[PDB]
Design an enzyme around this catalytic site. Structure first.
Site, PDB file in Angstrom:
ATOM      1  N   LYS A  39       6.643  17.351  -1.192  1.00 56.69           N
ATOM      2  CA  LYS A  39       5.282  17.020  -0.828  1.00 56.69           C
ATOM      3  C   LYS A  39       5.283  16.544   0.607  1.00 56.69           C
ATOM      4  O   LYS A  39       6.360  16.232   1.159  1.00 56.69           O
ATOM      5  CB  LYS A  39       4.695  15.936  -1.756  1.00 56.69           C
ATOM      6  CG  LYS A  39       5.570  14.685  -1.834  1.00 56.69           C
ATOM      7  CD  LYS A  39       4.993  13.644  -2.806  1.00 56.69           C
ATOM      8  CE  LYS A  39       5.830  12.367  -2.779  1.00 56.69           C
ATOM      9  NZ  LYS A  39       5.288  11.304  -3.671  1.00 56.69           N
ATOM     10  N   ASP A  81      10.571  17.027  -5.796  1.00 56.04           N
ATOM     11  CA  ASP A  81       9.442  16.176  -5.392  1.00 56.04           C
ATOM     12  C   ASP A  81       8.959  16.578  -4.012  1.00 56.04           C
ATOM     13  O   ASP A  81       8.747  15.734  -3.131  1.00 56.04           O
ATOM     14  CB  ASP A  81       9.796  14.682  -5.414  1.00 56.04           C
ATOM     15  CG  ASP A  81       8.564  13.791  -5.246  1.00 56.04           C
ATOM     16  OD1 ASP A  81       7.446  14.259  -5.554  1.00 56.04           O
ATOM     17  OD2 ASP A  81       8.697  12.650  -4.765  1.00 56.04           O
TER      18      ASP A  81
END
Ligand SMILES: Nc1ncnc2c1ncn2[C@@H]1O[C@H](COP(=O)(O)O)[C@@H](O)[C@H]1O
Ligand SMILES: [Ca+2]
Ligand SMILES: [Ca+2]
Ligand SMILES: [Cl-]
Ligand SMILES: [Mg+2]
Ligand SMILES: [Mg+2]
Length: 414
Positions: A129, A127
């Site tokens: 980001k 994930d």
């Protein structure tokens, strides 16, 4: 395990994410502040949990969240980590809206260095980001820190508490098909880099429905006007990261080594670094002269109880010595740094024999500083040997080292 309430006071909440909640806590003895993730034990899905968390603790990289300990009580696990005060890289993008090639490369080099290190340790982020990259502080060129990974196998996340809409910009197309290999992190890092340079997601849309449709096609372009003012080198790197087929997509190490990254990551020692280099060299020699008992005791205190504010000078030295940007010092980097130090002083390296060379000196040193035998001098090993032992002599820090296992104890360290 261990008792959280004995050692720490909860001060305030810092945030809430998928796996639990994150609070600021203070060590009752040292008054040093920390971030602690509190995870309810029923959320588990404790022997293998502590085993995987132990791997997280031993991650030692300047761009990866540092974890100090995992504690437990009847209701919860407590994962105690270094506290970072600069907020999310996301907020920095909003304020700046996009970055020079120089500034983007410095940021993304750190993401690449962290992700390379994670993948070498068989960890996939899944994930990656800007919301999951924190700035260590509000200082100008501070390090960034990758957070929010490693728990998805051991604990049940609350899907609601995760920002799904944000994640969608960043997911690789194979993730839509149920795949989460190392290569998916490279794609996400390429989305980040596209955004740093242009200010706009490569796969964009009004809502999550349109975004994911664009992700599945893999189609993106450098058509926005600002891309005309961006070099071919940067676009070449992005094209290699946003390759549809993971097997053809470059690795994180290839990202870290790309020529565009190298151009803007040329940090090398200068005359102004000589005071700290001389400081580091003296402490390293003293460290290499102390016996295996003292050495292992010093590593423990430096790596767990020092603060960012105390290691900042040494962190800048480390970065300048780290020629290949992987966040670790290998044998040749120490040899070259030794040679550069002498050159800056105006001293011919051949004077040393009159009683051995830089090369023999480093080769004799590597077995003593690479205490874990990893093949490279990681961040915490360098700090432990290069830090002024004087700061580690704080009474409170000795008190905490003692409590983890006194008058005799203080003398033994001294
Ligand atoms: N080491 C840390 N220092 C400061 N804040 C943190 C830290 N770790 C997590 N946070 C905050 O807690 C939020 C949720 O954490 P996480 O569940 O790990 O994504 C983050 O987005 C930050 O606002
Ligand atoms: Ca290196
Ligand atoms: Ca090592
Ligand atoms: Cl965590
Ligand atoms: Mg409880
Ligand atoms: Mg998060």
């Amino acid at each position: 395990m261990g008792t959280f309430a004995e050692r720490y006071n909860i001060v305030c909440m810092l945030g809430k994410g998928s796996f639990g909640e994150v609070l600021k806590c203070k060590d009752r003895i040292t008054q040093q502040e920390y971030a602690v993730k509190v995870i309810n034990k029923a959320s588990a899905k404790t022997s293998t949990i502590l085993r995987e968390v132990e791997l997280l603790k031993k991650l030692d990289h300047p761009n990866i969240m540092k974890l100090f300990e995992i504690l437990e009580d009847s209701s919860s696990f407590y994962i105690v980590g270094e506290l970072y005060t600069g907020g999310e890289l996301f907020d920095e993008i909003i304020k700046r809206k996009r970055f020079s090639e120089h500034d983007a490369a410095r940021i993304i080099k750190q993401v690449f260095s962290g992700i390379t290190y994670m993948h070498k340790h068989n960890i996939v982020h899944r994930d990656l980001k800007p919301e999951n990259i924190l700035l260590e502080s509000k200082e100008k060129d501070c390090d960034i820190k990758i957070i929010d990974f490693g728990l998805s196998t051991c604990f049940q996340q609350n899907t609601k508490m995760k920002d799904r809409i944000g994640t969608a910009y960043y997911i690789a197309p194979e993730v839509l098909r149920g795949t989460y290999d190392e290569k998916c992190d490279v794609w996400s890092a390429g989305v980040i880099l596209y955004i740093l340079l242009s200010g706009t997601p490569p796969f964009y849309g009004k809502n999550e429905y349109d975004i994911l449709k664009r992700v599945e096609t893999g189609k993106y372009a450098f058509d926005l006007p600002q891309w005309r003012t961006i070099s071919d080198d940067a676009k070449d790197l992005i094209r290699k990261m946003l390759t549809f087929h993971p097997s053809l997509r470059i690795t994180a190490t290839q990202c870290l080594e790309h020529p565009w990254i190298q151009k803007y990551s040329s940090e090398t020692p200068t005359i102004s670094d000589l005071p700290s280099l001389e400081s580091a060299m003296t402490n390293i020699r003293q460290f290499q002269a102390e016996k295996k008992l003292a050495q292992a005791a010093l590593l423990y205190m430096a790596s767990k109880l020092t603060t960012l504010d105390e290691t900042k000078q040494l962190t800048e030295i480390f970065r300048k010595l780290d020629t290949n940007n992987d966040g670790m010092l290998d044998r040749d980097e120490l040899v070259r740094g030794y040679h550069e130090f002498m050159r800056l002083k105006g001293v011919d390296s051949n004077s040393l024999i009159q009683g051995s060379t830089i090369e023999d000196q480093i080769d004799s040193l590597m077995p003593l500083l690479d205490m874990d035998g990893s093949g490279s001098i990681e961040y915490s090993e360098f700090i432990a040997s290069a830090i002024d032992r004087t700061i580690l002599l704080s009474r409170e820090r000795m008190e905490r080292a003692f409590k983890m296992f006194f008058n005799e104890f203080v003398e033994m360290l001294q």
